[model samples]
Target chain A: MNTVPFTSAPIEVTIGIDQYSFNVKENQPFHGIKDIPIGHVHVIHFQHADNSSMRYGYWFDCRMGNFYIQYDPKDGLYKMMEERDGAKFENIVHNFKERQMMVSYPKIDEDDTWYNLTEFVQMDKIRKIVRKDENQFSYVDSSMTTVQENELSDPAHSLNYTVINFKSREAIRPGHEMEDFLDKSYYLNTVMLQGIFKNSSNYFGELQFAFLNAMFFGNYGSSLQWHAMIELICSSATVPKHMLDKLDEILYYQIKTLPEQYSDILLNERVWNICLYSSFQKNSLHNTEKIMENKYPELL
Target chain B: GAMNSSNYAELFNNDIKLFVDDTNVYRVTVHKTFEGNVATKAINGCIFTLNPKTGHLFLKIIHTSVWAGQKRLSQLAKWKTAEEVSALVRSLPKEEQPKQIIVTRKAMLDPLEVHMLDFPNIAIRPTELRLPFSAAMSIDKLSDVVMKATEPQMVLFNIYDDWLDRISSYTAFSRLTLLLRALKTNEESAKMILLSDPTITIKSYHLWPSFTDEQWITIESQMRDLILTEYGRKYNV
Candidate 1:
């Protein structure tokens, strides 16, 4: 029995992780799902209260931008799919941590030419709230917002347009991977190096050069992070193709000849981390230990 | 009595200093941790906050464990599950109980404007790295001279980056130091004055522990995008 008050100020609400901020004017009512954004598009039906849908036939207008979701028979999640769209990319979770993994980075079938690199976070919950003001929401028809009885009765409704976890949720889109953050990946890289190195002597140097040239690179102000580099050559990215085909085949040879010690945790990103370290970081680490020794000779 | 600064200090057995007034709060849960001889906890200066941009209400329960040194803390607060939130709400006094409560969950994606949740910092646990045995260093006249000064964890890490300027080391850098940083046991950011690479930096510690299959699967996806972004940047996407 409650309607969101139409006030001049934007009403802000947090339902799960997503924050929705919108202005509700007195006469306007046709807000639609386009106002809601996504790289991964899925949907849920929600009303002001957690218990029920809008009963007054005054649905928030689709013209203003909001879309209804359908239940997917393929997967059990509610999705924003209606008729059709190519947003659904395949591959459930790219688990590269195959220990027995033959680390010769696999060939990619997707258009990994960096054309479609955008990603989106999950829009999971729908208990969603807003703010208050007046006492009036005008009468309206909701033909556009809600699915009709005929649309619902069709057998193909669930199969036709509905999508769940397009790009399979764990698709290798690097722009938004949680561990891709500079700080988090740094620690992860350190762990990977610890397990993968038999000795950090010329062996490490040989691999570093190959790694940098293959997928890991540095120039200008931009440097590829370890997580990204590891993923690049770790069986799911296109750069592996580049490394394999390149004439000198620097990384290909290094990877081919990699000793057993370096082969353990190629993808322990869950219990392990994969990372690449620059020569500069190596030299910096070397230099620091010298200072630690010089100053605190007592511990040495 | 209403919880105040003085009560907050007494509640934590005098280990904590910061306090948030809980007169209106129904309940709060505090965390404690033990590391070697040192036992510590940190509380944030304030608890409740209303974010202006997102317009979401946050009730932060500040608790911590010391890591490197000084105000060094392992994690600000371990993210809790929804059930934990519900339990605390249920344990409150009848008059103070809430009619409705919203416990916001975190997201791992970035926003057009809204702030995103930070990924969890998973430390590499170790059963092997804790204890030490035989000496890796050779006995010499210098060995006798060196054994007097022992510094706290912070002092060493402070100059950690500083030594970057001082170019030198045994065989350049010890890969061991690198391993220690990744598999940081005891003091996460602590450093031993190894004076040598691959040489006896002193002490022995085990390698990291095995992770559960579930943990590995979840964290792997988190790192998935890290790979793609590199491709994006290379092509300037």
Candidate 2:
């Protein structure tokens, strides 16, 4: 086996911008601001241990701004320019930085609709529906608009529509529930919607009627409350006052009250409850931050 | 009646005892239920048979675990309940249990058995007879020989089999080395060997920054030969 050897001491050196040559020197020197030379070719080199192996690299403070060069065994030498003039490398660098920021936990607000959707709904149910029905379609909505028949065929709606609609209008009729209760498969579409809300992933978008089958037809099963909620959600723009009231009562009283008991029973249940609260808080913070950034860039 | 006997008749000797009365040989059907571990669901009520006089018990389970839930008409709820009952029965101590038990047997057909029955061949196990080496032989020549040697359908099947076998046997570097070595010694033989194994022909070429220059060069050269052999043989060039 080939084992990497380690070095006991730290190595320091500087790279020159003009000559592009590495200068080896030893000292932790901090030159005063008054003694700073403009357009000077100065660099700092350091040696660090990685996985028991010592790696030597250098950073150059040149006229063209900060530049870093490091020797990697796998890829040879890699260079990172702090300030690049062209848009090519700049975009990649900017995107990388932005990605890092996005990786952190998202701040949600109480008023954020998407947060509300995720809070009350479960994704597990959705994945099941996708598994059952091969013809399910999913869309995301920007405005609370009713989906038209033509919208179902639209390419944008087909891929990433702002709103998802039940084109068949089967979920809207009266006595459907009573009929579905008799034969579980009768209300399969409703069952799928229940699953979609339970498990809210790309399964909804990928598989058509996946939500319907998952909740009703397949091995997995879900509750009736979710089925009702999905029917109301996918129906149209106007949410009936009675239904909305029922949903609110369920969300505020039943679901909210059970959190503490559920939490004690299952740690994840508690965490999920906390996540619901945090999601709103995060949405507010995100929107505020975005507004602040847009209105007062200097403050940010 | 013999050909279209129900599953009950097939399972119990009593069901078929009336038909075989004159023979004086009583065929008793023995059955047992196997309880699965925590990871597996209980497989209960698997019926088979035994003759107490002969002390012979037939191992009747012939299907893979996947087929347990394949009955179209059976509801999962009922099936699971049945499974639980069978497990309970199976878990009982032999001394306390009744003289005979009912068992549902799951059967699986062996791949070789199916193949032999479908196609008559002297050798039970399929064997590859590698072609002889020639300097002038290329990938195309090897492909021609293989195509001529086997049926078109068998060629396709053998192609996939050889590919999978070679992939299992050799690493990318080793495969490439073998390919290059064969090419250097004899191009035709090299082609034949690569064509003989589809796995070697379709090689994964990933250039890693961690590789030494020498190692990279060595792997690259070998990979090139292997690739060329595949392309030539596949196209009959």
Candidate 3:
């Protein structure tokens, strides 16, 4: 029976860092606010012809943020509540008020209140909460977001970048689906390397090995990614050749003891192709593979 | 098994990871003069002697963003990897290339109070030589003081909950020595350093700074009852 009197314009709302307004012209029908905030709210706005507006808050949006209330009930008792699940609006608003009390406010705390800030009350440990990657906005609530997130900073919303993006063509291949092929866990944990030259050499070898691994371990997953890895090594040559040779020897010791099926990576095509333009005069690609295979044979 | 279990290739390639892990977990450097410019010398780890001091020892806890600090050291030090201190017999006329570089201070030099470094083994039986204190013998003397305090051997070493590892790493021996000093001093308010290490159980006046700061008023009232009840009569506080 209570209604809030208001003006003709739409009420302002925040969607991530972007801004927009939401309100519906009354006696018509309920339409979704375009580009709604990720957390869907139960109430939709409706301003009547009398210049009055009200919000119908029900069970759906109020109990959001994955709020859990444990109930240890009496064994013989049973309680069931209805959740009018319609974001398009009319079905959830009760049949009588469906037409009249479309703006039947859940808790008529007055129009000055603006928003109940439901949906994002408390989150219990969501992984990659704000951003998709390592550490950003690990915890949040709508109450917190409303203050911290600005809706009017810029019109161009690049807000969708926080989602996980393995790539467009990453599907249908199991080996290339190597989620941790680019594992940065230990790299971040490690201290910065001593010398710039050494750091340059180290990064170069890492990419070379990534392409090497993709050929052997993965189904040559993300050829472009592997190509990107090789591309960096080829385009840049500030890093020294001895660095990779030293790196090759240490890695070779580990696999040298395996059977020919395992150790044959010494003569693998990926190894030969990259070594084609070796800095050393004697180390031509064809002779290089032959020399490397002979130098480190299978011990097993 | 050979493919994914371990990547020795990455291990060998990652110079940063190899260098850092090889370095010491703790670095001990003496604040002293070297090469006459008032520099510090990082001796190959020094022996600690806590001079039977009292009050809460305020040791600094170094967070390992110290990882960056360790990297910064290598920026300059790695290139200067020339050998030092092995110049026994000078073949070439001694110039300041490697710097013989001991130390010098002159104020009429006490008008004639000679101070010199008597390398431990170089000249052993100098008849007029006055020895500083026992380096090796001091451990047993300290041990004598320890057993003499507890009378048998409550002062233990080789303590290992899993054969392992302190404030600045000296708390291993420094902590035990401090408690030994506390018992000897008959010190009532035993203020041990509230080291960042959570394993240190000894209480100190630092009991306040260690609190989370929300309800420290709640803490003081409780500790007041506990401290007074525990050590009240001994020091007559």
Candidate 4:
């Protein structure tokens, strides 16, 4: 077997106007000083070697001025870094972690307002409605287009608009179970979201949803809480099994697009193939259950 | 159901009943006896299911004490008895049976003559299966082979002695993880069963010194929880 050579020894890195040595290990972050200048940081992987490599050009924080640099052993350079860059630092952290770990965030849209919908709608009850529905009703694409527009304009209030539209169409009404309105609304919203991202240039969104499904519903030794959250979107929205399968294909495409450096860090083709196959396997089992339920109701 | 050391023998024996069932495919690992041990013991076993249609594989480990009799038997003596082999053939499902059943060459305790006498109708072939690529193979070539070899097949590798020692290293662990991933992808129902020493425990450590003791503990706990919780849910134990 071919082995990638790596050292356990710590190396000194100097940063800021004055070069001060701070010991750091490969694939680890060095946060020696709180208020160090962030223009460039010089890294020396081997302590005995006199030559050092410089990592230049980063947008630094003027106010807090706190930052850290991580030397990715696979990249053979200091690439990973974090700082209070802007108002979207929260989103940045989320995106960064998602990219590094190859896990996906829930589809909250770009603004991350799905949390609001959870407060108003009883998601568990909505899930039951979708699960119970067997009629396989089809809605117009125009209706979905309207929901997509609403999602983009006011994501926080999109659920209310969707519920209103459903009520107007007499699909749901006053005194009816809240679950009925929420179920259709979730279905419409989910379908619209899927449509919007179907041909999107941002392939990450597609792969993210696939990982989200596997992490949430497919039991392969991940957290139940995160899975439950994604399951709410999936089951309540009644996402199609084929759609989930297609998401796996998109994930494979996205993985292929990744840089060569990621081959070691996250893009181990074997690991991904196993995960993808497991997803397909789960989908097949789900379809078989559906078929049995439909064809042999007496047996069920 | 729930398996303990005492009830495990009965459970292990009963579980092999699936081996005969045509609808189900299996990957099995037969454990070898300890060298220079004081007491004679039945060989332990580990088996997994490889669902051809869905490509789903489920794993189960059986203790050596589960075997019926024989304390100090030779490696081949385990499968030499005709009574034991017949039981396996008798229980197979009547219709729509498996296309092929493969067991590792090392795991089989007898030659072809014993198998032929035991089940004339069925084919229980012994084979040698190794990782698809070698050290000289490029990553892309390795990926391609794994992607193309998707089929319902079972292969077992004995984890005795040097096998355990070699796989315990970090490099081997990473390589195995990657290889397994690709194999799972290509083959819808490809399953591998590894039989190793019961006493061995594999723990991986990150060499980075920046992580504090508390941080390390947190990371380890999270990883452990993710794995254990998922397994518990998946197997329903």
The weakest ten consecutive residues by lDDT in model 1 chain B span B151-160
**Would you estimate the TM-scores of all the predictions?**
0.17, 0.16, 0.19, 0.18
lDDT of 3 by residue, B1-237 (tens): 111214323222212110001122123354546555554333221112111111111111122233333434432121111111112112223331111111111211111111112121111111121111112112333323332331111121221111112122233223333333333333233332222346543223211233333333343344344445556667777
Name the top lDDT candidate: 4
Instruction: Give the C-alpha miss distance for residue B156 in model 4, angstroms.
Output: 17
Residue B142 of model 4, lDDT score:
25
Q: What is the DockQ of each candidate?
A: 0.02, 0.01, 0.01, 0.01
User: What is the C-alpha lDDT profile of model 3 across A65-115, one tens digit per residue?
Assistant: 221111113521111122234332233333424344223333333521212
Scored against the true structure, residue A263 in model 1 reaches a CA lDDT of: 38
Can you rank all candidates by TM-score, best first? 3, 4, 1, 2
Model 1 agreement with the true structure over A102-168: per-residue lDDT tens digits: 1222214463321111111111101111011121111111121212223424232111111111122
Query: Once superposed on the true structure, which residue ranges of model 4 sit more than 4 Å away at CA?
Result: A1-300, B1-44, B47-63, B66-69, B74-89, B106-118, B131-237
| Maximum-TM-score candidate | 3
Higher-DockQ candidate of 1 and 4:
1
* Residue range A47-94, candidate 4, lDDT tens digits: 212233222212222232323444455744433243445445445444
Ten-residue region with minimum lDDT total, candidate 2 chain A:
A1-10
How close is each model in CA RMSD to the real structure? 29.5, 30.8, 29.0, 29.3
Off by over 4 Å in 1: A1-227, A231-300, B1-37, B42-48, B51-57, B62-73, B76-237
Candidate 3 structure, TM-score to reference: 0.19
